[PDB]
Each structure stands twice: as C-alpha cells, then as structure tokens.
Design a protein around this ligand. Structure first.
Ligand SMILES: Nc1ncnc2c1ncn2[C@@H]1O[C@H](COP(=O)(O)OP(=O)(O)O)[C@@H](O)[C@H]1O
Ligand SMILES: Nc1ncnc2c1ncn2[C@@H]1O[C@H](COP(=O)(O)OP(=O)(O)O)[C@@H](O)[C@H]1O
Ligand SMILES: Nc1ncnc2c1ncn2[C@@H]1O[C@H](COP(=O)(O)OP(=O)(O)O)[C@@H](O)[C@H]1O
Ligand SMILES: Nc1ncnc2c1ncn2[C@@H]1O[C@H](COP(=O)(O)OP(=O)(O)O)[C@@H](O)[C@H]1O
Lengths: 192, 427, 435, 416, 426
C-alpha cells in the first residue's frame, strides 16, 4: 500500500524526500589505500577478479548510486525573499500577465540583470536580455526577436547603452527597477 | 468508520469556558475542576508555544483520570499539532540507547510547516496529439472560461506517455517538475469500448490554465533527521528502529537550518507535546537526561503521569516521591487529581453507558455507582459491559438490577479474588 | 495423522441456549461459573463493540484454564483470528518487549480484504478493421478500433477494444493462438502462453503452453484474502523492487523486526478505514490469549495497561497460574497472581474452582474415549482415585502407556492390574519428593 | 519570534575590566566567586596553551551551574566549539562507552581549514567521450575540459542544453539552459546562463571539528570504486580505531597547521550530570585528562557524598572518586538569597516577556524562597496566561496565588 | 629464540621403563604427576579412547601448565594441541557453548594423503582448435613436450590475462595460475607491470609428489559455513563474520564426520585425535560445566586436559554453590584428577639453575643459594623473574656472572606480592 511517511495529508514521497535535505557530510575523504612498494601478483589478481565480478551485475546501476551530497546549493526562493523590490516586481508581473500586458524591465547594473534573470526563471517568465556586451546589430536582433513574439513576456535592458535601435513597442509597460539620478544617464534614459 | 470504543473514548475534549472556568460535566468529563483547569491552562500554553522546556506532572490515586485528562488534552489540542503519547517502558530498545530514544521522542513532537510556492497548470485535455517516431506533440487544455494549446517537448511527451492521459482527463501538471497527476475524467470514452467504465468528475477551475502561486504547506516533524542519517531513509522512517545516528552534524545542523528557515520565512516551528504515561518506569539515567534535555529551545511540553507516592527510583536504591529524582520533580510542577465522589462516579458511569449505547434502570445506576465507589471505576465499566451483554442475551430492553448483580458474581474484583485466593494455589 | 494433542477434547464452552452451564459441555466438564463468564466474554467479542478489554483466568493449577481458553477459541471459530502467546515469548533479544506485545496485538486483529476484477481471456485472433483517417484532420491511414477474437472453451466472443492498447499487444508476444489475460479497466495484456492444443508431443518446452480457459470470456473473479494487521505492517515495513537489495552480506540479516509507532498506527489505520468504509475490506478483531502472564516483566505490564487503553487494542485473555508472588523485574514487590495491582484492576477475574473427584473421573473417561481405548469400571475407578490423590494431569497421562501395556500383554481393555503396574513404573512428583 | 528557553536569559559572565563580579549583569546575578573563577577559566581557554585540564562546577541544586556553563559558552563565542553532554549520553548500545567519551573529546576540538576549490560551470555544449572531452560555455567564454572518466554522469545530464556545475568531487546538474522559448510547455525548468568564468578557484575558510575528519576517514563515502559503494551500502556504525584516531589524523592536522593550511581551534566539552557515570568512565577520564591532546572539560555535578554507579559499594564526594575529584578543580556555588531570588525572577520575567507588579514580584519571591526558585519561574507563564484570560495586561498577586493553588510544588505534593 | 616462561620444558622426562626421572628434560621432581602425565600421553597416543578428561590440580606455581606443555611436546606436532583459557569462552558474537564445541572440534585433526601432479606449459604455444579441443606446449629447463587439455581448462586459462612467454601451472584435476615472464619480459626492456617476474622453472615438465596436509575438523566446518565463493554469492566485504554465530551439528557436523569416515575407509584421510588443554577452568560458568561434562561423553570428543589453580570456592554463575577446585561435583567426577605437589628448596634451586642455563644467565654458587632463598621466601616465580635483571645489572656493572651483591640489590629494588602486601598496610 501507499503511505505518507510523515504527518502531511497527501504528497508525493519523492517531493517529501527532496524538500527536507539540509545537511551535507562535513568532510568526507576518499577511501584508504595501502601502499606496499611491492605489490604481489596474487593479491592484485584477486582484487581485479573481484572488481570484475562486482562490475558484471551492472543491470542494477545502484539507482543513481545514491551518492552523498556535498554542495547544498542555496534555495532559489532566496533570490526574491532577499529583497522586497523583487517581491513587488513579482506582484506587478503577475498582475500584468493576468492582464496580458508584456513588461519592459529597466535596470542599471549587469549583476542586477543576472538577479532579474534568476528571478524570472523562478517565476518562469520568458525574457530577452539586451545589454552592452551585445553589439548594436545583436541588440537590434534581440529586439526583433522580442517583437512579434507573443511567447516572450519580459524585456530586460541596461539603460546605459544608446538603445537607438529599438523601433517598435509591444505592450507599452515599463518598470524602472533602479533609479540612478545621474546627470545625463537618467535624462536620455527617460527620453528614449 | 469501524473502530471500537476504548477505555478513554467517552472523553472527547477538555470542557472549558471562555474564561477557562471548568464545568461540572461536558465533553465526556466529570468533576475534578482543579486538575481540569490546570490542563486547560497548560493546553493554552502549548497552543501558545512562546516558551520551551515546560513540564507538568499529573499525580493522583489510580482511577482518578490521569490518562483520562491526558487524552482529553490530546483531543482538545486537535490536529496540526503533534501529540506524541508513549509509555515509560517504550524507551528501552535493543538497537538504540535510552538517551537516543528520548531524543527521538522529543524531536518527534515538534513540527515545522514548510511553505512551498507551486505553479500548477490544470484543465481538460481536448487534444493530446503526439507524434511518436516509432518527438512532436501538442496539448489542448480546456477550462470553463478559456482554452489554450501548449506545444509539448520531448521529455514532456515522454512523461505524458508514462502516465496514460486520454482526451477528457482532468490533470494537474506541475510546471516546475512536470509531474503528471490525473484527477479524473469529464466524460465517458466513446460509449463503444466494451471496457473501462468509470464515473465522471466535475469540470476544472475557470482560471486553471495557469495557477501562479498555489501555496502548499508541507508539514513535517523534526524526526526528519532519519532522512539524513542514512542514504536510504524510508527503511528507518517506516520500520527500522536501529537509528543510532551521529548526533553531531545531524541534530545541530538540522536545528541550524530550521532556524535559518524560520528567519527567512520558509517554515515556522510548531512545538507539540510529549506525554510519557507511567513515567516512573524510566531509569534514573532517563530522568537525568530529561533534566538536561528539557532545557533546549526545541524542547516540547513534557506531560507526565505517576501513580505512586514514595517509591524507589529504577536503576538505584534510594527512594523519591513519585519515583522521580528530587531534581526533575522540583523542576516541574505537579497537578494533583482528587478522587471522584458518588455523584461524579454515577455521572461518569452514565456517560459511559451513553457511549456504549446501553440503557439501564435507575436502580441499576444506583447499585452500579455503589459497586464502583466500593471496588473501582474501570471495574464498574467492565460490569456495565457484562450486564449489557447479559441483558442482550436475556432478550431484554434495558439492564435491570438482576443483570448487574448477576455479572457481579460472574466476574470477580481483585478484592474478592484475593479473598477467594486463600486456597494457597501457589507462592 | 490424527496426532492427538495434550487436551483436544475441548470443542467449545457448551453453554445451553439460555446461557447456563452443563456437565457435558462439548468436551469440557464442570466449571459452571467460569464457562458462563467465558460465554459472556465470547458474546462480547462477537459483538465487536468494545476494544482494549482484558480478562484474567485466575485459578489454581489443573483447573483447565488453557482448556477453557481453547474451548472459547474454538467457539469463536476459525473465522476470527486467535493468536496464542505465552509470557516467555515476549523476551526477545532482537526486538524490545513492548514492540513484541504490539506485534502480537496486531496479529490478534484480523482483516478480510475482498478484490473483484473483470478480466477477459481466450485464444486471440487479432484483426484491425481499416478505418478512414482522423476525420478532424487530413486523410491517410488510421485505426479507430482493434478487434480481438477471444475464444474460450464455452465459445467465441470478439471484443472491440480501444485502439490505444495496440502498443501493449505488440509489446508482449501476442500472436494468434495464445491465451491472453486482459483487464477491464487497466487493459494491460499478460500472455499466459500458447494453447495446449498446439503443444505437440515432439516440442520440448515448458511454462509456454497452457490449457484453454473454461467458462465465458468475461469472468468476474471474486477473491477474498484475510490478513492480520501485523501482516500488513510487515509487508509495508521491508522494501521490494531493485535498489540493490539482492546483496547477500549486508542484507541477508532479515531479522529487522524493530518497528516504530508512526508506521504501525497512522497511515496503516487510515488505509484500513478507507478500505472498510469503501467496501473493499471488513475489519475482524480477534483475541489474544496470553497464558503465564505472571512471567512478564513489570516493564511489560506498564505497557499492557497503556495499550489496553487504546481504541484499536483487541480482546486479551490473561491466564495466570501462580499466586501471590514477587513481580518479575521488581525488588521484592509482592502482588496477587504475580501481576501488579494496577493491571489487575483493568482485568475481569474469572475464578476456577478445583475439579470434584466425580469431575476427575469424567475427565479421565472422556480423555480415554478421545484416545480410543476402552477402560473397565475398576480401572477407571482406580484412575479417578489416583487422580484425586495426586495431580489430575497424572492420571490422563497413564492412559496411553497403560493402553500399550495392555495391548502388549494380549488384552484389549485397560484392566486395573495394568494401571496398578504403571503407577509403580511411573509416578508423580509428590511421591518423587521423597529424596 | 524565537521561543524562550530555560537559560536564554543568560548572556555572559558580566564581569568588569579587572574581572570584578558585579551584583547583576549580562543576565546573571550573584555567585561572584563562581563567576570570577569562570572568568579565569575562559581566560585559560583563550590562552590555548594548556590541554587536558578540567573543572567541576559542584553545587547545590538550583544554583545555576548549567546556566553558568551556558553563559561561559556564550562569553567564549561561537568560534571555539562548546559541546554539551549529559552523563547518560555515554551509555550507548552500538558504540563503546569510553569510545563515546573519546569521540566527545574529539568533537569538542575545532579546526578551521582553508582550501581552494576549482569549480567548472556552464552549459554543456559537447559531451563526446574513458576520458570525456566535455564542453562548457559561459558568458565569458568556452573551454573544452579534459575531465576524468570518474566524473562521467550516470543520470540524464543531457549532452546539450543541460546546465552543470562541477567541483573537484561531485557534479550538480543545476538546471536546464534558458531554452524556455523552444517549447511552450516542458517538464524541465530553466536557469540563466552562468556569467562567471568556467574555471574559477575560490578559497573557502571552512570550520570543522577533528571528530568530523575522524569519523569520515573511519568509514569514507567518497571515491567511485564499486567496493566503496558496496561497503557504505548499508548499516553505518561507529567505534573508530585508536590507530586511525591518533597517528595519521594528528599528523595531517599538524601538517596543515605548520603549512598555514589550517588553524587549530581548541574548544570546550561540558559533561553535565557527571555524578551518575560509571567507574569505567572515571578510569578512562583519568588518562584522558592526562593527555597533551585532550581539550578543556567543564563538569557540573549536583549530588553530594553518594555511592558511585557501577560499584554500588563505595561512596565518594560528589559521586566522583577522590582520585578523579582531585584531578578537577572544584567551584563551590552558593544558594541564592530571597533578594537575589526576587531579582532573578524579575530578570526572567523581563526576558520571558511578562509584566509583573511589585506585590506579584514579592509573592513570587516568597513562594520561591519557601518552596523553590525554579518553581516560581515555572509559575511565571501560567500567571501571565491567567491574566490574559482575565483581561489583565500585568500579573497581580491574586493571579499568582490562584496559580500556586492550582499547581502544587514537589514539596507540597510530597506532604500529601 | 625469545625464551618464554615454559621454554626449558622440552619434554616430560620419562625413562624407557615409564618411571619419571628426578630431573630430566627440563623438569625437576614431581614424580607422581609426571607418571600420570606419561600414562595419559600414552592413552592419547593409543587413539582408541575418546572424550577422556584429565585435571592437573595443585597449588599455584607447581608447574601444572609446565606439565601440560611437556605433554604437548612429548605428543609432538603431528597431533593437534589446542591451548585454551576459560576467559576465551566469553565470546561476544558466539555463545559460550558454541565456542567450547568449536575448541573441541579444533582438538581433532586428520591428515589428508594425496598425490598431486602439475602440467606446467608454455603459453606461446597456445593453439585451440575445433574451442572443443586445445593444445598447450611444454618447455622447461629439463625437457620439452606438449599436452592435450579439456576446453574447460582453456576457459579457466583465458580467464586469466595470459601472455606469450609466461609460466602457467596446470593441475591435472582442476585449477590454473599464471606466472609472468620466463627470462623474456626484462629482455625487451619494458618497464614493470606492478608484478614481479620469475625465470623458467627447473625439473621435468610433468611433476608428481606426495602431499600430506594436516587439517582439523574445525577448518572443514568453517569452510562449509560459507558458500565457498564463485558466483555472485562470492560477495565479501570488510567486517565479514567468518566465525559465524553457530553451526548445527546434526546436518553440518554430521556430514563432515560422514565424509571424513568415508575418505578414511577409502584410505585417503587419516585421523589423528589431538588434545584440548583448557586452562583456568574455574573461570567457566556453571552453564558451561554442565555442557562440558556432557559433550566429553560423545563418541567423538577428544582428550581434554584441565587445570584448576584455586581450591574450593563458589562456582561461577551460582554465587551460592561451593565445590572443590571451583568445579561442580558433576563435572569433577569422571575427570581423572592428578594432584601436583609443592617443590622443595633443593628442587627450587635446581629449577632456578635449569632456567638460568636455558635463558643463558650464568649464576654463581652463593648467588644461586641466595636466589633460591629469596624464592622459597615468597615463591619460585619471584626468583625466576629476578634472575634476568640480576644478569642485566651484572652486564651493566661489567660483571659476566651474578653475585650476591647484584641479586641482593635487585631484590631490594623490586618487590614481590608478600613484600608488597607487608608494606601496603601503610
Ligand atoms: N473524570 C473521569 N471521567 C470519566 N472516566 C474516568 C474519569 N477519571 C477516571 N475515569 C475512568 O477510570 C479508569 C481509570 O482512570 P483513568 O482515567 O485512567 O485515570 P488514572 O490514569 O488515574 O487511572 C478509566 O477506565 C477511565 O475511564
Ligand atoms: N473440565 C475438563 N474436562 C476434561 N478435561 C480437562 C478438564 N479440565 C482440564 N482437563 C485436562 O487438563 C489438562 C491440562 O489442563 P490445562 O488447561 O493445562 O490447565 P493448567 O494450564 O492450569 O494446567 C488437559 O490435558 C485437559 O485434558
Ligand atoms: N547567576 C544567575 N543569574 C540569573 N539567573 C540564574 C543564575 N543562576 C541560576 N539562574 C537561573 O536558575 C535557573 C536554574 O539554574 P540552573 O543553571 O538549572 O542551576 P543548576 O545548574 O544548579 O541546575 C535558570 O533557569 C536560570 O534562570
Ligand atoms: N618439575 C619441574 N621442573 C622444572 N621446572 C618446573 C617444574 N615444575 C614447574 N617448573 C617451573 O615453575 C614454573 C611454574 O609455572 P606453571 O606451570 O604455570 O605453574 P602452575 O603450576 O601454577 O601452572 C614454570 O615456569 C616452570 O618453568
């Protein structure tokens, strides 16, 4: 029969085991290895025969080998929870998608662009990022791919490039995530 | 639905008022206003959970309702809060030390409600056209207010092939992992196949096409340590008691990550209760451990019951009240249960009869209350059952005096057993 | 092989329709009040309304406590389970005492689980009637239905099954002429094997040819399986299916009987209730006869008088033979019947008086009858007299040896001389005490 | 909020610049000589020069020896490990008792090691194979790594579009590449392309204890040979041998130290309830304390002259034999006075979040000096709940009176 | 040689007529116990009786263990002799009765007579034909030939990584192993391969010799207590409990006895019952004595020698029953008791001189007298222990032999049980 393995009402056991895995081994080393400068042929042959015998039943595969955990990466939730700006952005994007309007996210730091990328991936919102690294023609190609493609929801810009290549707008919704208050940057930014 | 009424089934909560004022008879309890008010206030403290490591000792003569008030508190606490009931002799395991069993029992009555944001797409599969090469596929989900077609990927197509999903099936696909979860069907299957007959489930939510922030609160106890001690944990979480895991890197690390989750809003701690019935059976080492284990922040509320006065502590020679060392006994506060009077006994017997669905005359109630005040209460309930059975056999409607008096001679009490025991059967 | 046991004459409490007691009570004689109490408690059990109730069969040795216990057990019938246990069995070196007690309690509880499955079988004649391509799309070649010509011993019946099953058909070697095991709802095909009609004597192969099915193609097989709650506990305890469990060294130690309360209670109880209220199973609480209860440690009684408090605990029939004795595991703590005074308050004591010499004679005679050996009046009187002198169980043991002595001496019936000679060849402990 | 504990009110010894024990500070109150001795002990610990020393905080019940040791731990800091232990913890059914105490001594010691880990991250562009020439692509550039066969992945780990992060000794399939536009609905979830360079070395200053390395080298779980997986397949256990305990471990730790790779961090081991240990534990502690590698141990005994467990024949002071009781310094804590009792009650009420009136505080102090201080401490919360139910924000004398009437102390229950 | 406590005991010291000499073969005095030992040793050599028991009872330091070692030496290594101690029975993974039965089985030995022959051959000549028939070449330092083998041997051979120019041993009945190199691997100048090479073997290509392997029934039991390896059942890892909990007697030990009897009737095996010397018998529990007085009654039990140092006392596990020699009257009876008497001062001095001669220490006349006096004062063992440091100090001081000064100084330096107890009253 099927059991819950815990106090929760109903949930997939796989999800149960995957949710709660805080601890990783403190300091697991490799196995010990005797080092006799001479290695007698008898013992080495016996060990090779044993290894061959143990490798023969490979049809099991040990079900992924159940290898230990040694990384414990941080949860993706923390990207949003770490900043209220990202929670407000999540609420705004959910509202806009319920309304069907695309969104144009404007940020100043490329690291903030990567943060926004991870955030949208946490929210599964398809996006197209246009930054300074991409050449003018590459920026125009990215903008063309964003345009006429209703499957792309968000567009992320750096606000530091010229951005004179953009031609058409999709939903007429912009979100100024960051404010610079710089002499020339903000002016031309808001202008275009 | 088929679960027989036990010895403590008559009680179904701790009768209390808005101001915590105890009542004469309510929720299956009778009399004992002091201990019942103590139970109510300790239950309020439990449901508060602001303080940790509090202990209460329920003392009194046998038959005073210690286990009764314990089960009443357990019931009044209700679900969503763990209540680990255990006997003093259960900590003695041949695969785990006493201290380890006590740690397991303490961490077992502590819960963490883990919040998880989910994004599930649901609807009616109008078209599941899949092009198998032996790669391409499209799913047409339909709702009561909108429709949408989704181009399926190779892995998604394979997953759909795993869990057979025919047209008209109500499914809830998780956009995070793509797990196929079928809930039912919206209509029959062509009315022509001479097989596969079932019932039709209601239509899906109108906005079920894409649920954005479906919040599911996964509740799990701090016994999750079993998930880490070994690569294969189900064996330990289900049957295997040989869980002598390493205390370091497991207890401390799990507690640290639980604190991190509480600080980051992922989960919230809900301390439960640990009820050790007949705690006097614990060895002095177990009491010494409870002395220190009761000081941790994750310590649940430790309710204990003792049916003795001055008695020797197990594992030593010297005696202490309630069989508990002076240290732990002084740490906790004791709730004494006063014996029940004749009226309370009669009312408890009547409540039990109502629970057993048995009826008896007034003279029967009187004589049975007399017998119970003389011998005991539990013996009075045994006589209730025996007389009800004798009446059923006699084809009567209610139990009269002639049935209780008959079963009184048919079944003997320990007081009369020891009287007839003068035949020196053995020693 | 009849293999007559020690005391098999007992067949039931033998109570009259009114519930009173009689002499010829289906093998067991005497013990009127005790047999009436046994009838009351067996009526209770049959009612299946109360749980966690215990009864104590206190009485001096030789009163036939185990006899009346087996009598009430037989009266209950093989329908409800009856798990006999002795206090010594609780002492286990691999599993704690309280968990053994809980496992025994679970065993005492029964559960009948029904299972009805509509399955179709018979020799297959596969054929796909060509149908126009999907009318919603373009043209081409499709299959809207797949007809399978299941032929059974009674006749033939073609089934126009769903076309999606065609994958299963091709998966297994389902060729025209073999027996397939179809499922109504699931639809999965499980080929049983070719028909024996094609099993030519010159073809060397086994497990591949099976006889034709007898009966209609559509068969609604109704099967009932009675398994105690402990069986389900054990089944859900250990794993099955891959996971490198085939190892010998690190896995052959199957005795992991250690069990936790979370799995025992909780999920198992909930699924049992779901099967009950849904109509898939019927709960059948049995009885747990625990003889030599005085042999249990105080750590066992302290858990018993807590498990009996549970609503799921079954009926327990304790049978203590000792008198006032120190509780095991305690420091000179004398209590009646070797049981703590706290547990005796939760058990109904059924007192059993000593058998009257006439009852001794009746028991000896009925045991001789069960054994199948005739005994003369004088021999029976001498047996009764010696059973009155010493323990009664000594006399019943003098029947078979006296019977063999008589048969070897050339006579059939057991004469007084035979029992007299056996009493000198074999004697009891009371006489052996003369060291 | 964080739920209150029994000793969450103590924040430290609260001593002056010269060690003078103030009447009340840092949550503690009274026990000036004891807190000065504890200041000297924490100075010893910070010295990191002596090894194997121990102290016994023997005193009457309720004096706060446990709270005192916890305040000591807090004052020392989180860096230096502080391992709490109960006397009953030594009794185990799978590991030898003296060996339990040994592993406790070991875990009590800390070790801060520095290591540089090379991490390989990026979307897998090529997965052609023993040695596998994998191709990782990132925002910076692409590199074809000549990775070893031991890292060859068994699970899906798609040859293309799979985001993988590897470090030298296991691989983690972070997520699928950002191809969310290729399909409208796919089971796989996506993450952005890693912006960091493929090959990067980061120095992590990880803090671990010596017992971690001990138990890890005891039953390692690394490597890839099938024999390893079969060994660690089931039934982990304990009882590391002494040859592996000492010897290789100490040598490698000293190597890391003298080479600047690691830094030793001596810790503390608080063996509470030492009064109920067997004579074998004491006999092993004799040689444990007499070791140049044993850490500082703080004992907290409560019994007086009683029979030592395991012998049930001979009695000794504090339930500890004289030969051992002399090896450990004695800290004599005195009982609190009614004034100090009321002061600590007020401190706990302030920490516990309970407002108590003057008359209520006086009644609590009286009940404390009469029955027990901890009894009144326990009665604190019930009185607050009673006040809440009655609608009173602050506790009054009547509330504590009713509470005491409901709950009977141990002494009163014994009188009955 | 690392002289031990019982090295000078190289025999029992009986003459041709059977009488015990006053001092011979390292033993001194104790004529009655030596005669009993020389009688029981002949009893053992008879190989006809079974389960007969002996008890070397006597005060401490009387040489009961010395007499046991003398019996063992006189018997010779051809028969098993299991030195056993009572404390050894208290095993944690095997029950005491089972450990005792395993020791009893070890005390029985059998010699397996077998004539094995080899078919060493060259691998370079490997030329199979049909996988159904294979031929291998023979090239040794004394001859060259060729053999014809069953394809099963070819399979077992190719299983090994054979290479041209290797020396392979092929047994006529079963088995095969590889020896790499025959003065050709180092010739090509290719580096090592984690293994050592060997030149071509001398002698004829086909060799035959008589084999006699001394194996005991316990070895057979241990070998049959496992699957023997081979297929996937060969799974073997660390912590394997080779000394398994127990092994049934009727279906496992009985089969071993049956096969041994069969091979003995066939003349292939020869039984040689040994001796089981259980020292410190008083340490065994009463539940051990009760099974011991019954197991030694079986038709297969070997001769068991006992030695109880302490006299009458409470039996182990009883705490109330007291019997002489710490052995219950049940087991005490049926066991031939050999009383050992105390040594006289002259016998003590003679034993000291023999110990000095054996260990190489040289003592003077007055030194020997003083050492014997110190011995008879407290015990002979104290003098035996002081003998070594006496010569050690003598060497340190530049003296070759021991003198009165050195013995007196070393006696004052150290202390004995009597002296220690005398000063322990402080
Ligand atoms: N207040 C009460 N109301 C109803 N039944 C009670 C009460 N107190 C005791 N009993 C009955 O007395 C018997 C034993 O008393 P219990 O409730 O276990 O208290 P204790 O633990 O002191 O024995 C039980 O069968 C229980 O039903
Ligand atoms: N009333 C009876 N009628 C016939 N035989 C009886 C009766 N009572 C006891 N016996 C006999 O007594 C023997 C054992 O009785 P048992 O149930 O073991 O009592 P106890 O367990 O107290 O010794 C049985 O073999 C049975 O034949
Ligand atoms: N010096 C102190 N200052 C403040 N509170 C104290 C002090 N000493 C003890 N306490 C209090 O007394 C209670 C019990 O002290 P504890 O450490 O358990 O004493 P012991 O160590 O003797 O058991 C603690 O909850 C703590 O609040
Ligand atoms: N007959 C003897 N001749 C010479 N040396 C002896 C003789 N008997 C005993 N010894 C010596 O005395 C010592 C006594 O040792 P041991 O036999 O163990 O004494 P016990 O009689 O207590 O077993 C032995 O080391 C042995 O060398």
């Amino acid at each position: 029969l099927t059991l819950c393995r815990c106090g929760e009402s109903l949930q997939d056991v796989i999800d149960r085991v995957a949710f709660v895995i805080p601890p990783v081994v403190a300091a697991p080393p490799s196995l010990r290895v005797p080092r006799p400068p001479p290695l007698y042929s008898h013992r080495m042959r016996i060990l090779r025969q044993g290894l061959r015998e143990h490798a023969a039943p490979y049809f099991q595969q040990l079900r992924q080998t159940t290898a230990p955990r040694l990384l414990q990466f941080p949860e993706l939730r923390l990207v949003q929870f770490d900043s209220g700006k990202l929670e407000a952005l999540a609420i705004l994007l959910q509202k806009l998608k319920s309304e069907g309007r695309r969104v144009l996210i404007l940020s100043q730091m490329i690291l903030m662009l990567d943060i926004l990328e991870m955030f949208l991936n946490f929210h599964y919102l398809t996006y197209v990022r246009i930054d300074e690294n991409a050449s003018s023609e590459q920026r125009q190609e990215l903008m063309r791919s964003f345009n006429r493609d209703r499957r792309i929801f968000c567009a992320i810009l750096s606000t530091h490039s010229r951005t004179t290549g953009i031609n058409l707008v999709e939903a007429d919704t912009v979100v100024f995530y960051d404010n610079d208050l710089n002499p020339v940057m903000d002016a031309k930014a808001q202008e275009w | 639905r088929i679960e027989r009424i036990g010895a403590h089934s008559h009680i179904r909560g701790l009768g209390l008022d808005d101001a915590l004022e105890p009542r004469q008879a309510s929720q299956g309890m009778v009399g004992q206003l002091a201990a019942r008010r103590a139970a109510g206030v300790v239950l309020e403290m439990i449901r508060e959970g602001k303080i940790a490591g509090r202990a209460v000792l329920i003392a009194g003569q046998p038959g005073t309702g210690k286990t009764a008030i314990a089960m009443g508190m357990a019931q009044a606490l209700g679900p969503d809060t763990p209540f680990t009931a255990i006997a003093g002799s259960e900590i003695f395991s041949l695969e785990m030390s006493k201290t380890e069993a006590l740690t397991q029992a303490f961490r077992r009555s502590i819960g963490v409600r883990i919040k998880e944001e989910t994004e599930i797409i649901e609807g009616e599969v109008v078209e599941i056209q899949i092009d198998r090469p032996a790669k391409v596929g499209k799913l047409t989900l339909k709702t009561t207010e909108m429709e949408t077609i989704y181009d399926l990927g190779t892995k998604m197509i394979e997953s759909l092939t795993k869990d057979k999903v025919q047209a008209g099936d109500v499914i809830t696909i998780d956009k995070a992992t793509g797990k196929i979860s079928k809930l039912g069907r919206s209509f029959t299957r062509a009315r022509d196949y001479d097989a596969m007959g079932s019932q039709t489930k209601f239509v899906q939510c109108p906005d079920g096409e894409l649920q954005k922030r479906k919040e599911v609160v996964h509740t799990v106890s701090l016994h999750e340590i079993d998930v880490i001690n070994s690569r294969t944990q189900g064996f330990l979480a289900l049957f295997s008691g040989d869980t002598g895991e390493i205390k370091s890197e497991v207890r401390e690390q799990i507690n640290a990550k639980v604190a991190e989750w509480r600080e980051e809003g992922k989960a919230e701690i809900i301390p439960g209760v640990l009820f050790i019935d007949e705690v006097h059976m614990l060895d002095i080492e177990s009491f010494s451990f409870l002395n220190r284990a009761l000081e941790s922040d994750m310590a649940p509320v430790l309710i204990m019951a003792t049916n003795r006065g001055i008695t020797r502590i197990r594992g030593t020679s010297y005696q202490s009240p309630h069989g508990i060392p002076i240290d732990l006994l002084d740490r906790l506060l004791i709730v004494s249960t006063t014996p029940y009077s004749e009226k309370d006994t009669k009312q408890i017997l009547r409540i039990r009869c109502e629970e057993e669905d048995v009826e008896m005359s007034e003279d029967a109630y009187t004589v049975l209350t007399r017998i119970g005040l003389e011998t005991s209460l539990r013996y009075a309930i045994q006589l209730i059952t025996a007389a009800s059975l004798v009446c059923r056999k006699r084809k009567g409607t209610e139990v009269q005096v002639d049935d209780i008096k008959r079963v009184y001679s048919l079944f003997l009490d320990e007081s009369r057993s020891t009287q007839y025991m003068k035949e020196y059967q053995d020693a | 092989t009849q293999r007559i046991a020690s005391h098999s004459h007992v067949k039931g409490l033998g109570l009259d329709e009114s519930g009173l007691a009689k002499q010829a009570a289906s093998g067991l004689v005497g013990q009127e009040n005790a047999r009436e109490a046994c009838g009351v408690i067996v009526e209770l059990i049959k009612s299946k309304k109360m749980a966690g109730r215990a009864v104590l069969l206190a009485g001096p040795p030789g009163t036939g406590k185990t006899a009346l216990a087996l009598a009430i057990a037989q009266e209950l019938g093989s329908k409800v389970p009856f798990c006999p246990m002795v206090g010594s069995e609780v002492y286990s070196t691999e599993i704690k005492k309280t968990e053994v007690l809980m496992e025994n309690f679970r065993r005492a509880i029964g559960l009948r689980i029904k299972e009805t499955k509509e399955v179709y079988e018979g020799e297959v004649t596969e054929l796909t009637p060509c149908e126009t391509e999907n009318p919603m799309g373009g043209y081409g070649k499709t299959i809207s239905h797949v007809i399978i010509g299941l032929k059974t011993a009674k006749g033939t019946k073609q089934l126009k099954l769903d076309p999606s099953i065609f994958e299963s058909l091709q998966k297994e070697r389902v060729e025209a002429g073999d027996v397939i095991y179809i499922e109504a709802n699931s639809g999965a095909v499980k080929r049983q094997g070719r028909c024996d009609t094609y099993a030519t004597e010159f073809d060397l192969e086994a497990e591949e040819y099976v006889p034709l099915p007898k009966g209609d193609v559509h068969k609604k097989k109704e099967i009932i399986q009675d398994v105690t709650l402990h069986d389900l506990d054990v089944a859900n305890a250990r794993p099955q299916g891959g996971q490198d469990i085939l190892s010998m060294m690190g896995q052959l130690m199957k005795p992991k009987k250690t069990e936790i309360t979370d799995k025992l209670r909780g999920e198992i109880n909930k699924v049992v209730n779901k099967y009950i209220d849904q109509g898939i199973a019927e709960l059948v609480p049995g009885v747990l006869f625990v003889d030599e209860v005085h042999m249990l440690d105080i750590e066992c009684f302290t858990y018993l008088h807590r498990a009996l408090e549970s609503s799921i605990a079954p009926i327990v029939i304790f049978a203590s033979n000792r008198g006032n004795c120190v509780i095991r595991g305690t420091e000179d703590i004398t209590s009646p019947h070797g049981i703590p005074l706290d547990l005796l308050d939760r058990v109904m004591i059924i007192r059993t008086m000593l058998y009257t010499p006439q009852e001794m004679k009746q028991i000896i005679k009925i045991r001789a009858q069960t054994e199948g050996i005739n005994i003369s009046e004088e021999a029976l009187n001498h047996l009764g007299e010696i059973g009155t002198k010493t323990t009664l169980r000594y006399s019943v043991q003098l029947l078979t040896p006296a019977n063999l002595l008589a048969k070897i001496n050339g006579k059939d019936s057991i004469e007084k001389e035979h029992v007299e000679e056996i009493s000198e060849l074999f004697y009891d402990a009371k006489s052996s005490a003369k060291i």
